[PDB]
Amino acid sequence: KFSFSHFLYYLVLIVVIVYGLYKLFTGHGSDINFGKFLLRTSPYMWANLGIALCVGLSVVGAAWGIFITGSSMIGAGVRAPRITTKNLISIIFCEVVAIYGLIIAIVFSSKLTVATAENMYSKSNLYTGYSLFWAGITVGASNLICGIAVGITGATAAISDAADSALFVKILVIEIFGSILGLLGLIVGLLMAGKASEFQ
Amino acid sequence: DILSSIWTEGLLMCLIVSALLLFILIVALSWISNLDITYGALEKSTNPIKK
Amino acid sequence: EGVYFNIDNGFIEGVVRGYRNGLLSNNQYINLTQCDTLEDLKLQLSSTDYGNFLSSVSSESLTTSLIQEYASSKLYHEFNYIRDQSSGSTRKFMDYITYGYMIDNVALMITGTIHDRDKGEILQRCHPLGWFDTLPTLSVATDLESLYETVLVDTPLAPYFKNCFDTAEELDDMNIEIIRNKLYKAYLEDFYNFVTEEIPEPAKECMQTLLGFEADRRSINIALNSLQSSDIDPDLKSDLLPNIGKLYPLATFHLAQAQDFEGVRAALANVYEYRGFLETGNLEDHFYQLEMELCRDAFTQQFAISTVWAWMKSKEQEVRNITWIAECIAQNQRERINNYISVY
Amino acid sequence: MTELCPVYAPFFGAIGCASAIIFTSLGAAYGTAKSGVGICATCVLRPDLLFKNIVPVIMAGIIAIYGLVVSVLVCYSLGQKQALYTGFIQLGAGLSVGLSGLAAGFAIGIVGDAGVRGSSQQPRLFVGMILILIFAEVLGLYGLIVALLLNSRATQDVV
Amino acid sequence: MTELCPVYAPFFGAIGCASAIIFTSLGAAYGTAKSGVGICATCVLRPDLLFKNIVPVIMAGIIAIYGLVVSVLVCYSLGQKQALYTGFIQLGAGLSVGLSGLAAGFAIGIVGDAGVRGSSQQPRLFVGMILILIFAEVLGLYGLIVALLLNSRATQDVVC
Amino acid sequence: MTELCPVYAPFFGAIGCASAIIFTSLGAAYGTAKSGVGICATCVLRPDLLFKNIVPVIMAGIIAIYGLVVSVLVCYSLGQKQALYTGFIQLGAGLSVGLSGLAAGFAIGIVGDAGVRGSSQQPRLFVGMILILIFAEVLGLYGLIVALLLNSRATQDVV
Amino acid sequence: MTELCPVYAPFFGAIGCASAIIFTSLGAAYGTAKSGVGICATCVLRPDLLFKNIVPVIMAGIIAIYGLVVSVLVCYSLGQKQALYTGFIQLGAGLSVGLSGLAAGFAIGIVGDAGVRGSSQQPRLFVGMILILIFAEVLGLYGLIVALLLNSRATQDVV
Amino acid sequence: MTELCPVYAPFFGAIGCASAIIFTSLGAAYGTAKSGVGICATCVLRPDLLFKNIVPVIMAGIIAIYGLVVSVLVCYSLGQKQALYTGFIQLGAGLSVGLSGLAAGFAIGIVGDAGVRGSSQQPRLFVGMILILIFAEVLGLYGLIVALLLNSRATQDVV
Amino acid sequence: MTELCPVYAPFFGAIGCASAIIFTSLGAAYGTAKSGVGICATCVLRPDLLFKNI
Amino acid sequence: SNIYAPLYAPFFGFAGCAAAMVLSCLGAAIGTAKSGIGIAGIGTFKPELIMKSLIPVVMSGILAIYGLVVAVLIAGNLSPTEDYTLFNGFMHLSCGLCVGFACLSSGYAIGMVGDVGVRKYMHQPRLFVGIVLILIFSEVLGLYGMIVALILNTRGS
Amino acid sequence: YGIAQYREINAGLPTIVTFPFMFAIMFGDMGHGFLMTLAALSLVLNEKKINKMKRGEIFDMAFTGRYIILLMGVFSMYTGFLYNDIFSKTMTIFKSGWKWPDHWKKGESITATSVGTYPIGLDWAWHGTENALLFSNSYKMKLSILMGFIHMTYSYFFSLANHLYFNSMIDIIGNFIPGLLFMQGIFGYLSVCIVYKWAVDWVKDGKPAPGLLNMLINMFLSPGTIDDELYPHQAKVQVFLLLMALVCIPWLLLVKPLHFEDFGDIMIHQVIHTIEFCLNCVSHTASYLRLWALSLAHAQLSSVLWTMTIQIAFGFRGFVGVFMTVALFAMWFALTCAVLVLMEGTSAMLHSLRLHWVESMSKFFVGEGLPYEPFAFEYKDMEV
């Protein structure tokens, strides 16, 4: 774009492509692939570190949700403290849903053991290394996005209150709908994680 | 067994994932570069009917 | 949205919504209809949004000037605090809004030849928020042309100085009205430029077209003033007609080209928005009502810079109608009691 | 120098703690800066609460010790050559705790200064806006336990 | 020469030692720079605070002192022949203190700005703002002690 | 060709020599540009008191001579009979002093701008600003002193 | 394995159909949203008109059907061992029709809000209405037709 | 695996079969969106410029098929085995012609909108607006005049 | 051939020599231009010191 | 083992599953986020039609549930100890991304549609039938990605 | 927080009783409760006169309860001692605990001999390496789950306890009953397994063992087995218990539509209520885990604090260590007063308050009355 940052980011987009084509004309490009790297690392990449990320990122997702809510909370309260209790209710949804990631992180981090020197790349542990990220990133991202959606919707409700308290229940369904995915992703990910195995 | 070992000088895996850290740094810095200062409260009107 | 508008305007949005919902209710207007004397207004002037501090101004024969001034006082305090707690975008939005309410103030600085209006009276007629530390208006003459350089240096109005430099010391309401229309065009251009520059996606329209219609009303009013005897250069009219409105601009330049009742009619015949220029019933009050309806038609979006622009209009209109009913009682008329230009 | 017993333990063992303390510094600077400006702005209006709204200062300070505790743990555990098991995990824990602290920083910051501006005019919940405050702490509290679980796993049993 | 004592071990050593002072100094400079404006905003108007407002520059120069001390202490632990262990640790050790002090400055500049520009009206907030003024540098102190012991163990673990 | 004392090691030293002047230039240039723009706005109505703004630029001149003298020193140490360690220590010293000057110039420029704004009215306030100036310029002296031993102590006995 | 069908030949052979329907769905979303924002804009004027002015809303269903039918009946054009050229052509077929639907959506419905507003304003434009929609739609029929070509031809040069 | 008829020769033709259309579809969509969006305005203002205002969209539609024709015709000579020479030349022809047609679409879009906007105030203005419009769509002819010949050169030696 | 003495070594000098002149060219281009704009803006009514303003 | 039978075909399947569910949840969350705005905005003056306005946001959940059902069905064919045919590993993520983008597109559609489609509808509440039947187009969009992905997965060994 | 209507069984009791004990067990320890009870002791001592003098911000509301501080503190000591954590410390004087292998060797996998008999809470056999907590947490998983499920079912009974108290059988019985069924017919199968490990000793049992939550997987995709057959005849009820436990919700909801067609006004609330309860059950179920979580978190906090405080001055020096010890205890005071009592209490009270609220009041105050709020003569003073 007109800003140096975006132009810089668009600079190299084709440098790798041109080098690869030149090396394919030279011979090395034919020897370019990721399968070497797929089986070059260890599943400790794929298990040891693929755990805290989902927890932390769902945590910051609930963080953004609470950023959103807390404003509208006192925004509605200041004019009329007839809502304070009614204000401080759905926030707990965001507070709580964050721990779905901790659930799986803790329960499967228990399953962590030594990655066997033998069969580092077999159907025993590297498979489980894959599944570890997959599940963790999957659930964590789902949780972050549910958290942002619920926080924003809750703020929307918390600004639709000063008009009338009686309107609360009639519009109470939105967060009810939102929160289901927070458990849905959790269950699907935990299923896929349990069906597989650990470092073995 | 790597794309290019010249990129490797005893560290062929050490920093290959050291980028997401800086990505998080910059994404946070985006809002760090943002703030509020609300001078209007930091000074008081000369005439009360102003505010 | 989620990120399009949500940076620091969350509690700002909440307070703005509480403000907008806190507009005068039909029950207040009905009770005013019960009020047929000034005392009944004052006593009723405690359950309203503007009440509980607007009573006790005078024993009787209330001057609606002070009533509406102190009614708008709380609106001004609310708006200035809204400006106090804001990000950069809303900060410049407030700055633009307040820099248009000094154009009347500078017109006051300019119009009088030598009157030296009381400095207290300067802020009692125009908005004091755009006003700041004392400016020469009483210790010196308020002349028309010699002072323009003094305010130029004293007050930064370059975006609002758009060939407002001209001959003014001719004892000419011509000069005053043309400089006021130049300032109107200049500020309209500046504020519409900001609208098209930085603005949320859904409120793009509700501000751009609203500025367009306000510029249209400005053009209608100035051309109407020019109908009787102000036939001057059509380019000067364009210098008067806000060039940024650009709603039925064919019709606007139709006004500019033709200087006659026929000219204005044919202009307001190829507009496709509304034909005609004069309607009985304080036509500017009718345009106030139309503009307020336009602004309030976008209250269902809970994150936009449109809610405040309509809430200011609503609150100042409620002050207007408080004055309206106060004078309807004062004038001893019981037919305009139900007549007003409020919609909330 | 292998997938069994590499030689680059200090790399990770030190960068983890460095990043932790760095994120602590970042969050603390952000929160303290905003809170100071907001409170000094508000106090002049109603200096009755000259210190009665300092609580965000204390909560911001709370987090200032996690990067120290985990750092000393790894410092006791860190060496040059260890098991590849204890070769890389620490970074995940460190970044998790630091980013959690940062996000809590933004929460406390924005929500608390909204409370502060509400303060001088609506003491209706002066003692009772503190709920928005006391919420966020669990945010940072979350990652600590999960991080320390694997911190112990790496410090005690390399296996 | 083994990476227990390679050629490019001090590669990280000297460079990190140089960098350590850098970011803390940058923060101090940025803070003092954008503080002087708030300082002057009323000095002519209310010069009755002429000696009082001197705090923020000191609060900035303290982290410069911090960078100085860390760099000086680490200076005598560098050489051509040293373990890559040292470079591995210093890959984060120096930047820790550097940009921690940087962030500290980034915060103190703004707090001092707000405090001074609010002070001219009500002198009754002197304690109020100076409280956070002295609160801030705890971050520096954290960095100092952490880097101290970190590099202590690092140089105690040099293979040689 | 060995990686111990590569012939292309001194390139780091050459680029360090370059920066030793590049960065001090950039800084002093921008700062003195601010100096000129401000002194124009000031001297206009008080053009007989400019004597109280002569040194503010000699400060930048002294800043420049720092880079000059460090360049004077680095010349001998730059060579192809060098050690990569030597080249990198030279690089670090040069870049460190350069960035220190980068910070210092910005700081001194802003503070001088503020002080000249103030000086147009106060007849006694010039003391009120040099306070900021001295403890702003010290940071450059920190950088200079650290770099002196960083290179000199290490630029010899390196093999 | 052989370069006629390298390791990345099966990748494209299974991926090509993956890229088709997505862009059609994107374009349908954009166009029909911009259709509704104009529909509601003035349908209060003489309601009971929504099966006489229902063209732009429905029009993107068939554009979606493009990607749907190609991506489904690609089934016959799949193979555990197909040539690399086969994979390339399959990828081209699966991407080009989808991006063609995308280009269709770029404007096929954006102008609907501009247009349909005139039904209650200038119903004399029963001719002017369908014009731009037709000139938009005529563009769309160029992608699926050329997709069918390579779809049928994938049966050749397969190994 | 053949320097005169390799398996990367089909690589230039596979995506070539869609490159011309990727350029031309975008050009046509841009032209349609630009020169056919605010037309409702003039139609309501006066619904008697219509039939003359229809040419630019017609030109856009006509130019649309330029990219498709070359690709589809050469697809009669598309396989896995044929000269990389032919692949080079046909791919280049397709890219050039498609992007030239995209340029034509851009030009027609940006000129036709202005033409229709100007025409409102002058019934005669079509005489100049179309006068300059015809120049807008020539770039497609410019591209094809050599793209077709180079495509023939691609088919001048079949496999 | 050798890294110490390769064929491409003079490339670096042949580029660096141009680097300085292009850099000074751009710097002067920005600077004297930004000077002259204000200089002429002032000289519009000041043909009295222009020769003193160069 | 065959090159078409490497040790990371289940890896591709897991990639497909993760992407499929995440994208669908993103689309759903965006839909809910956009939904609440107009609903909050309307109660101030019409707390009656609010109930009539239920359909879009609630109906959106089909995208989430079915972009998940696809992930379920592609699962149950991968063993903790077996690496399967490569083309199946690619087909998993192929149909998964298909659905993952179709669902977010539909979310974009209905989110920008409904939130604004009733703003002035308060003025003409009789328009319920029209304002609801308008979404018949948007709703059915996502269904077909799954209707294809089903037999798609039945096909391919 | 909220109020109820006439003839309603108000839930004051469980709020009074169960709340403080979660608060205490949350981080219950000797010193914490001891010191805060001492503070409450001084408070109630000066209650004679302190009441007249005004109160700090929090101390304002604090007067709403003074003995409650003791209520939480005593619970804290009791539960901490039950968990043998004296600032995260366990003493061996119980002398029941567990016995170890005779030649137990550090660095080896050591299991305390399966002969120990210390049914009283927790032993001292958890001070070894990581494994102790590593599985203590794993089992504590089910502690909060089971106790909270018991508490919530206890609360749930009061629903009909009031309904049929009003002799209400119109549709209320046919709503609680399907809810009661879809609740218990589901939780019971899990709960029987919760303690089944207590029942079945797998140390010497040659039968397949379960994962802590293994049984769930097959519950959904065609159940009928346990995947390790934890009990043969239980596989029959694994499918004989849900087929009817699920059809109750449609049985709950389809009562209205034939009343005179669908009522519409009823339908909206009815439909939302069905699914919202069907999910709120599991919401409340998953709730209670923080009692475990933050309790262990503060346990880690206390352990690390002890490590970085106590043994720091473990050296034996007389002339130099005087100030070392003085400062060490000074910072020990600074931490014990603030960090171990303030955040701990705030977090714990928050959790307990809302764990009561969004769980019990979610179904207690379905209908709510109005404040009778009596008024009469009173007293007042003069002050601006």
PDB file of N, CA and C in Angstrom, chain A residues 107-134:
ATOM      1  N   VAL A 107      -5.287 -32.333  30.951  1.00  0.00           N
ATOM      2  CA  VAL A 107      -5.588 -33.760  30.936  1.00  0.00           C
ATOM      3  C   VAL A 107      -4.671 -34.525  29.997  1.00  0.00           C
ATOM      4  N   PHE A 108      -4.289 -33.942  28.860  1.00  0.00           N
ATOM      5  CA  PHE A 108      -3.408 -34.631  27.932  1.00  0.00           C
ATOM      6  C   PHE A 108      -1.934 -34.359  28.188  1.00  0.00           C
ATOM      7  N   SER A 109      -1.589 -33.209  28.772  1.00  0.00           N
ATOM      8  CA  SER A 109      -0.222 -33.004  29.232  1.00  0.00           C
ATOM      9  C   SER A 109       0.177 -34.079  30.228  1.00  0.00           C
ATOM     10  N   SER A 110      -0.800 -34.645  30.935  1.00  0.00           N
ATOM     11  CA  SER A 110      -0.524 -35.807  31.766  1.00  0.00           C
ATOM     12  C   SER A 110      -0.021 -36.966  30.919  1.00  0.00           C
ATOM     13  N   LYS A 111      -0.661 -37.206  29.776  1.00  0.00           N
ATOM     14  CA  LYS A 111      -0.262 -38.304  28.911  1.00  0.00           C
ATOM     15  C   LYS A 111       1.146 -38.135  28.363  1.00  0.00           C
ATOM     16  N   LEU A 112       1.720 -36.938  28.443  1.00  0.00           N
ATOM     17  CA  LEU A 112       3.062 -36.728  27.921  1.00  0.00           C
ATOM     18  C   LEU A 112       4.067 -37.619  28.633  1.00  0.00           C
ATOM     19  N   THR A 113       4.926 -38.255  27.845  1.00  0.00           N
ATOM     20  CA  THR A 113       6.025 -39.061  28.354  1.00  0.00           C
ATOM     21  C   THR A 113       7.211 -38.865  27.418  1.00  0.00           C
ATOM     22  N   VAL A 114       8.223 -39.714  27.571  1.00  0.00           N
ATOM     23  CA  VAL A 114       9.409 -39.619  26.731  1.00  0.00           C
ATOM     24  C   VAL A 114       9.053 -40.008  25.303  1.00  0.00           C
ATOM     25  N   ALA A 115       9.492 -39.195  24.346  1.00  0.00           N
ATOM     26  CA  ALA A 115       9.421 -39.587  22.946  1.00  0.00           C
ATOM     27  C   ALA A 115      10.501 -40.625  22.674  1.00  0.00           C
ATOM     28  N   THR A 116      10.082 -41.846  22.353  1.00  0.00           N
ATOM     29  CA  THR A 116      11.021 -42.954  22.257  1.00  0.00           C
ATOM     30  C   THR A 116      12.118 -42.642  21.249  1.00  0.00           C
ATOM     31  N   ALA A 117      13.364 -42.915  21.642  1.00  0.00           N
ATOM     32  CA  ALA A 117      14.473 -42.756  20.709  1.00  0.00           C
ATOM     33  C   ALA A 117      14.212 -43.536  19.430  1.00  0.00           C
ATOM     34  N   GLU A 118      13.715 -44.762  19.561  1.00  0.00           N
ATOM     35  CA  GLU A 118      13.292 -45.535  18.406  1.00  0.00           C
ATOM     36  C   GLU A 118      11.889 -45.122  17.986  1.00  0.00           C
ATOM     37  N   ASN A 119      11.614 -45.258  16.692  1.00  0.00           N
ATOM     38  CA  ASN A 119      10.297 -44.950  16.145  1.00  0.00           C
ATOM     39  C   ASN A 119       9.892 -43.509  16.445  1.00  0.00           C
ATOM     40  N   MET A 120      10.864 -42.594  16.416  1.00  0.00           N
ATOM     41  CA  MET A 120      10.521 -41.180  16.507  1.00  0.00           C
ATOM     42  C   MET A 120       9.532 -40.787  15.422  1.00  0.00           C
ATOM     43  N   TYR A 121       9.632 -41.407  14.250  1.00  0.00           N
ATOM     44  CA  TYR A 121       8.774 -41.107  13.107  1.00  0.00           C
ATOM     45  C   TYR A 121       8.096 -42.408  12.699  1.00  0.00           C
ATOM     46  N   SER A 122       6.988 -42.703  13.364  1.00  0.00           N
ATOM     47  CA  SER A 122       6.235 -43.926  13.138  1.00  0.00           C
ATOM     48  C   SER A 122       4.771 -43.611  13.417  1.00  0.00           C
ATOM     49  N   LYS A 123       3.964 -44.653  13.601  1.00  0.00           N
ATOM     50  CA  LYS A 123       2.552 -44.500  13.920  1.00  0.00           C
ATOM     51  C   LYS A 123       2.309 -44.542  15.424  1.00  0.00           C
ATOM     52  N   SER A 124       3.275 -44.068  16.209  1.00  0.00           N
ATOM     53  CA  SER A 124       3.234 -44.175  17.661  1.00  0.00           C
ATOM     54  C   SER A 124       3.182 -42.824  18.355  1.00  0.00           C
ATOM     55  N   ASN A 125       4.105 -41.921  18.045  1.00  0.00           N
ATOM     56  CA  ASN A 125       4.224 -40.652  18.755  1.00  0.00           C
ATOM     57  C   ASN A 125       4.127 -39.433  17.853  1.00  0.00           C
ATOM     58  N   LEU A 126       4.764 -39.456  16.682  1.00  0.00           N
ATOM     59  CA  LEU A 126       4.682 -38.312  15.781  1.00  0.00           C
ATOM     60  C   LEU A 126       3.249 -38.090  15.319  1.00  0.00           C
ATOM     61  N   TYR A 127       2.515 -39.179  15.091  1.00  0.00           N
ATOM     62  CA  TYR A 127       1.073 -39.099  14.892  1.00  0.00           C
ATOM     63  C   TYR A 127       0.419 -38.322  16.032  1.00  0.00           C
ATOM     64  N   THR A 128       0.740 -38.707  17.269  1.00  0.00           N
ATOM     65  CA  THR A 128       0.199 -38.006  18.427  1.00  0.00           C
ATOM     66  C   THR A 128       0.733 -36.585  18.493  1.00  0.00           C
ATOM     67  N   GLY A 129       1.965 -36.371  18.031  1.00  0.00           N
ATOM     68  CA  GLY A 129       2.471 -35.013  17.954  1.00  0.00           C
ATOM     69  C   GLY A 129       1.604 -34.138  17.070  1.00  0.00           C
ATOM     70  N   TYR A 130       1.292 -34.621  15.867  1.00  0.00           N
ATOM     71  CA  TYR A 130       0.346 -33.914  15.013  1.00  0.00           C
ATOM     72  C   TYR A 130      -0.929 -33.609  15.779  1.00  0.00           C
ATOM     73  N   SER A 131      -1.590 -34.663  16.259  1.00  0.00           N
ATOM     74  CA  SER A 131      -2.892 -34.488  16.887  1.00  0.00           C
ATOM     75  C   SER A 131      -2.833 -33.488  18.034  1.00  0.00           C
ATOM     76  N   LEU A 132      -1.691 -33.385  18.716  1.00  0.00           N
ATOM     77  CA  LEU A 132      -1.602 -32.474  19.853  1.00  0.00           C
ATOM     78  C   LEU A 132      -1.822 -31.032  19.421  1.00  0.00           C
ATOM     79  N   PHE A 133      -0.944 -30.496  18.566  1.00  0.00           N
ATOM     80  CA  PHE A 133      -1.259 -29.216  17.944  1.00  0.00           C
ATOM     81  C   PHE A 133      -2.694 -29.199  17.462  1.00  0.00           C
ATOM     82  N   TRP A 134      -3.030 -30.073  16.512  1.00  0.00           N
ATOM     83  CA  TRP A 134      -4.339 -29.982  15.877  1.00  0.00           C
ATOM     84  C   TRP A 134      -5.423 -29.681  16.902  1.00  0.00           C
TER      85      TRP A 134
END
